[PDB]
Design a protein around this ligand. Structure first.
Ligand SMILES: Nc1ncnc2c1ncn2[C@@H]1O[C@H](COP(=O)(O)OP(=O)(O)O)[C@@H](O)[C@H]1O
Ligand SMILES: Nc1ncnc2c1ncn2[C@@H]1O[C@H](COP(=O)(O)OP(=O)(O)O)[C@@H](O)[C@H]1O
Ligand SMILES: Nc1ncnc2c1ncn2[C@@H]1O[C@H](COP(=O)(O)OP(=O)(O)O)[C@@H](O)[C@H]1O
Ligand SMILES: [Mg+2]
Ligand SMILES: [Mg+2]
Ligand SMILES: [Mg+2]
Lengths: 371, 7, 385, 372, 7, 7
């Protein structure tokens, strides 16, 4: 009667039924194992606490993210998380309904083939499909033309689009994402006087950034006002009760997106990459692309990011037209909403890939299925 | 990745 | 100015001082501080003593002293203790230098809070009123003693380890990492283990007692499995040391596993990845043109790396990483890979050599230091970097 | 004043040498790199700017940028720096001693020519110089007077039909597709395989890989089918770090972009179609001569089998009643430089130069009327 | 280029 | 240190 849409986000997993406006399962992608001897034999010990629980008891586990910068590194962890989400949380058998999967652009074909083979062989799903997060973002936004800023936890990419067609030759993928920002935040927090190394403190710093970070319209002016540090410093309460005061670090780490040179990467910022991508497009569609700029992902919720992007683009672009930035307040789950809407479409009921055709043809079929 | 970058 | 410059490394464990243009340090003393104490157990006063004593004399008379360490991991705990130590070393019996017309070189650890640097520079400018000072990174102070413009430093010592790779001279700040392992910790662990053996130890002076035993007996292995099988199948590796009181202790198995914490931080409740693994990861995370040059030239700096067998373990681990994570076991292509660890004989003191050679040519020109004049102004500090 | 210097400002490489020699005396790529890091060591205040083979050697800590893009200069400071380097460090010849010869692609903006002439006459005060076209020098090197030139360089590909003693300026077609786009597409596909390359150093690495392990396919579909049976076509390359990369279909995929520009998304035609259109636009009688002679030059046309594929495509498109011949000299890389040297050595050309007196009295516009 | 295309 | 570790 319905289908399930699963988004294997680089740092989080979103899943739910096709038709619902909100996901029914939102847990981070953590597959933790005990570090200590395994000494206790009573009430509850399990070889690998992977999943939602892992966050609660992270203090005695070596948390490892199965997916790194959009590409899977450990297949056992991914299969374990898939099994957990399908059974423990959703409690829906794979055979009952099909599954929808999404992945970042410009990914290796090996990952796609392995994922399709595992899905068709292990869980024997009746049918499935592979799509792109940006197109689902367009579907969720209810628009047919624009440029997508899919700045996820692991990968940031853009895909120019036009009415009824796309431009595969103008796709740019940047490895910079939330994980690098967290690493830089840890490094600077070290320069302040607070040290964080293990993965538990990695989660702590991730929460701190999620709660007390914002972008700066002007870097130099903000630094000068920080020189007069009497109205910008803020305090955060650690689990142990210790209080940490954060000043310039609030608006320093986000600036790494516009200044990749801070981490040492010889690349350009998101504004420069979007400008280059739009310039590579045809002249006529440049106006439409400028007039519509959709952004999505968990790395673009920092207040003031839209204003800074607008200012930078207008400064770079000619000052004779109007540039508009659209920032929906629900961009976190835009990909899932788009996937659900696409699945609900009547015309898409035949585009699925079934077991019979997959077995007769082979894993290479998915490669030709909408690129 | 296999060559270039880690993943 | 007086054309007089003294180079010092006010580290954590030991403090070294000397003049520029000197092959070897003139004076070497440790950082020991302790107020007089009387132990009802044994021993009474024999010779003269003072309320506050530090320096080499502690190493000989710690029996009747409450020895404490002022600095660990290169960070400030006790401002007054460091002030007393600085007064002692600057006194007329350790250095005997004129503060008002002298310059000094400081080597603070990389990746440390700016508060320590600010406090130390302010203290030097105010309490002692030095005309000028400087702060340098261990990378130059090490690579400059043998003429190397490119390499990776694995400097390890009391406190924490550090790494500061440099390619063609230009710095690479985004490829430095820190771990919570050092000699002091290897000591805490020789201790939990000899405790198991059945000996009760304190944390006041015996901490310094185990230093010599670790220096003589403790050694690192080549292969953990073979050495462990040898230890459990034989008892020839047993050895002892004569304690100051004449007591004799047996240590045959604990002398080998203590250094293993360097490659297995799990043993001491640290989520580390290993020195060799960390080095491989850091090299890989860089660009490509620099990986081969970094591997070709590598240095083993610091007194804590003088353990016998560390170079062999490191090179073997690096080769294993190269085999497994790149070639997937293809040994045939692994033969041509080459590594040459740089292990100068003077690995006990190389930073002082770098400072001396730097001051040899960077003394005539006055545009290098933080001159006393700039201190009196505001909107100051971060003069150079 | 005994000889002259010929400099070819290639879109990706620079060729220079004395007039008379059969081989260039200076062959280095056009790279103007600057440091990207901060710098800590004190015993070095070295060369804030880096050019030439030095830049190639230490490319790992530099942001390499090509001064010339698709045949048109974008940064004049970089071009002047490279000119100074080539003149002094490599050639070690003062500009005043001998004149200089310059070449540029057809259908280039007049602003570039005027600026180049002004800079050459003002900064280096060269006694005289001239501006020519690479294709005509290719003809001179080939020792022929009639044919069609396929000057597929690193930045621009163009054709210029010629006849005995005259040219056809109204049948000149210039295509922006060149080696740089091929390298970008190769990077994109290498990403699809599983190998990632983004920065400029890996750009040079991929350029070398293409230079060493790329070839054209007579039939695309047959080659793809044989790739489906991938047991005899895959080849391995050794990276500087020691990693081994296996390349299969990518060897014959990227070159096909020349014949199928739609791969990159460009709404244009292939080299075969453009040459056919150019020859058709010519007069009927000279079509036979143009078919009988087809000179090609440039660094993008060294792929083995390219000549055979071009011959097959042209014969299929052209009527099957005459003979079409492709001439592929094994030294087409430096054909332009050889032609420039031969032209300079010509006695009649000793008076066609442009000197400082006439340039100053007339102005920069003189070069525009000098042989178009 | 200056207008149209990059170069 | 001040937060994390002692020093
Ligand atoms: N409220 C927030 N403020 C800033 N960053 C956030 C916030 N919520 C999540 N994030 C960041 O966005 C990431 C969420 O993962 P995400 O961006 O959605 O990758 P994906 O798009 O592939 O699911 C997290 O790494 C987190 O650092
Ligand atoms: N021979 C040794 N064996 C084991 N550890 C040693 C040895 N020599 C020194 N160490 C350890 O190295 C630490 C200090 O080394 P060092 O680098 O000289 O301090 P610093 O960095 O201030 O110069 C000492 O605390 C000691 O524990
Ligand atoms: N051995 C080679 N094999 C294949 N291509 C090559 C080879 N050498 C150069 N090339 C290609 O030809 C280009 C340079 O040739 P070149 O003629 O100097 O360009 P230009 O016409 O602007 O001077 C390079 O970009 C490179 O891609
Ligand atoms: Mg995503
Ligand atoms: Mg030291
Ligand atoms: Mg050329």
């Amino acid at each position: 009667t319905t289908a399930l849409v699963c988004d294997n986000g680089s740092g989080l997993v979103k899943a739910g039924f096709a038709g619902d406006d909100a996901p029914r399962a939102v847990f981070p992608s953590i597959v933790g194992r005990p570090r200590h001897q395994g000494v206790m034999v009573g009430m509850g010990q399990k070889d690998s606490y992977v999943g939602d629980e892992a966050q609660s008891k992270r203090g005695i586990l070596t948390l490892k993210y199965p997916i790194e910068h959009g590409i899977i590194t450990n297949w056992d962890d991914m299969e374990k998380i898939w099994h957990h989400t399908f059974y423990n949380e959703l409690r829906v058998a794979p055979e009952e309904h099909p599954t929808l999967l999404t992945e970042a652009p410009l990914n290796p074909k090996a990952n796609r083939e392995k994922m399709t083979q595992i899905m068709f062989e292990t869980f024997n799903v009746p049918a499935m499909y592979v799509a792109i997060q940006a197109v689902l973002s367009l579907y969720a936004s209810g628009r047919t033309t624009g440029i997508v800023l899919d700045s996820g936890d692991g990968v940031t990419h853009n895909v120019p689009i036009y009415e009824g067609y796309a431009l595969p030759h103008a796709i740019m993928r940047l490895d910079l994402a939330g994980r690098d920002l967290t690493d830089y935040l840890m490094k600077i927090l070290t320069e302040r006087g607070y040290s964080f190394v293990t993965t538990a403190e990695r989660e702590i710093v991730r929460d701190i950034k999620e709660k007390l970070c914002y972008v700066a319209l002007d870097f130099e002016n903000e630094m000068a006002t920080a020189a007069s540090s009497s109205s910008l410093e803020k305090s955060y309460e650690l689990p142990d009760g210790q209080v940490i005061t954060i000043g310039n670090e609030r608006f320093r780490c986000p600036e790494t997106l516009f200044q990749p040179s801070f981490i040492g990467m010889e690349s350009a910022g998101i504004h420069e990459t979007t400008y280059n991508s739009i310039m590579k497009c045809d002249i006529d569609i440049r106006k439409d692309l400028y007039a519509n700029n959709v952004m999505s992902g968990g790395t673009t919720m920092y207040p003031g990011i839209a204003d800074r992007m607008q200012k930078e683009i207008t400064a770079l672009a000619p000052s004779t037209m109007k540039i508009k930035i659209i920032a929906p307040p629900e961009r976190k789950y835009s990909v899932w909403i788009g996937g659900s809407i696409l699945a609900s479409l009547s015309t898409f009921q035949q585009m699925w890939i079934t077991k019979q055709e997959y077995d007769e043809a082979g894993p290479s079929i998915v490669h030709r299925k909408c690129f | 990745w296999x060559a270039x970058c880690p993943a | 100015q007086g054309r007089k410059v003294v180079v010092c490394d006010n580290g954590t464990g030991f403090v070294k001082c000397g003049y520029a243009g000197s092959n070897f340090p003139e004076h070497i003393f440790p950082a020991l501080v302790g107020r007089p104490i009387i132990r009802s157990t044994t021993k009474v006063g024999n010779i003269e003593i003072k309320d506050l004593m530090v320096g080499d004399e502690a190493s000989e008379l710690r029996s009747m002293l409450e020895v404490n360490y002022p600095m660990e991991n290169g960070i400030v705990r006790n401002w007054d203790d460091m002030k007393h130590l600085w007064d002692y070393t600057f006194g007329p019996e350790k250095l005997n230098i004129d503060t008002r017309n002298c310059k000094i070189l400081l080597t603070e650890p990389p990746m440390n809070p700016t508060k320590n640097r600010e406090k130390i520079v302010e203290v030097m400018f105010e309490t002692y009123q030095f005309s000028g000072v400087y702060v340098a990174i261990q990378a130059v102070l090490t690579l400059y003693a043998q003429g190397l413009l490119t390499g990776v430093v694995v400097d390890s010592g009391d406190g924490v380890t550090h790494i500061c790779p440099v390619y063609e001279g230009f710095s690479l700040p985004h490829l430095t990492r820190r771990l919570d392992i050092a000699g002091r910790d290897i000591t805490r662990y020789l201790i939990k283990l000899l405790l198991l053996r059945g000996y009760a130890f304190n944390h006041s002076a015996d901490f310094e007692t185990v230093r010599m035993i670790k220096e003589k007996l403790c050694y690192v292995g080549y292969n953990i499995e073979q050495e462990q099988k040898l230890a459990l199948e034989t008892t020839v590796l047993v050895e002892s040391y004569t304690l100051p009181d004449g007591r004799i202790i047996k240590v045959g198995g604990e002398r080998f596993e203590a250094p293993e914490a360097l490659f297995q931080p799990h043993l001491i409740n640290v989520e580390g990845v290993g020195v060799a693994e960390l080095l491989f990861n850091t090299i890989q995370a860089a660009d490509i043109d620099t990986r081969s040059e970094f591997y070709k030239h590598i240095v083993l700096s610091g007194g804590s790396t003088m353990y016998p067998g560390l170079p062999s373990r490191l090179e073997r681990e690096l080769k294993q990483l190269y085999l497994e994570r790149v070639l997937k076991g293809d040994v045939e292509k692994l033969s041509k890979f080459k590594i040459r660890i740089e292990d100068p004989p003077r690995r006990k003191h190389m930073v002082f050599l770098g400072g001396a050679v730097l001051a040899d040519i960077m003394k005539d020109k006055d545009n290098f230091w933080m001159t006393r004049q700039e201190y009196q102004e505001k909107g100051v500090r971060v003069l150079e970097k």
